[PDB]
Amino acid sequence: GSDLGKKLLEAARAGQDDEVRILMANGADVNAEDWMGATPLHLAAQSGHLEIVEVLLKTGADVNAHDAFGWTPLHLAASQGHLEIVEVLLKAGADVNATDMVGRTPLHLAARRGHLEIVEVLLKHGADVNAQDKFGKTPFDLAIDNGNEDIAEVLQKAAKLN
């Protein structure tokens, strides 16, 4: 047939690591893209499938691929709260300050979604506390706007150390 990439995307999304292996062993492209521009690495990162993320990174997946929204796998993991995946992606060379279609970095998304440990990991890897999205908002602003007081404090303190 020829639905290899399509099936690999589905297997990565569903966390079916055995199917991921089978499809890759049969020639499926690890950098296949779905209708939204998401790759297997995007889909595994979104759904929290750590081990599939790790194996894709070992087998040629592009850590900095962006989808139609401008989201990278790191945006997705940071937004969804998958701390270990965030760490693995950063270790593999993910751009900590990549911006999506509205100018938001992974730190914006983690701050908005209230993921404190991810905020701290992103800061450790050089995330930009002063980054403004297309609406002029910093991650601190998005933390305030979403009632994430503890994250806002962490961000306000980090801005003093620049």
Author numbering: 1 to 162
From the study:
Here, we report the selection of designed ankyrin repeat proteins (DARPins) recognizing mTFP1 (monomeric teal fluorescent protein 1). Here, we report the selection of DARPins recognizing mTFP1, one of the brightest and most photostable FPs in the blue-green spectrum. We characterized these binders both biochemically and biophysically and determined the three-dimensional structure of one DARPin-mTFP1 complex. The two DARPins we report here bind specifically and with high affinity to mTFP1.
The complex with DARPin 1238_G01 did not crystallize, but the structure of both isolated DARPins was determined as well (1238_G01, 1.6 Å resolution, R/Rfree of 16/18) and (1238_E11, 2.1 Å resolution, R/Rfree of 17/21). Of these analysed clones, only two candidates, named 1238_E11 and 1238_G01, showed a specific binding to mTFP1 while the majority of previous hits seemed to also be interacting with free streptavidin. For DARPins 1238_E11, a high affinity with an equilibrium dissociation constant (KD) value of 3 nM was determined, while the affinity of 1238_G01 was found to be lower with a value of ∼88 nM. Anti-mTFP1 DARPin 1238_E11 and DARPin 1238_G01 differ in 13 out of 21 selected library residues, suggesting alternative binding epitopes, in line with the ELISA experiments. Despite having different binding affinities, both DARPins, 1238_E11 and 1238_G01, bind in a very similar way inside the cell, suggesting that both affinities are sufficiently high.
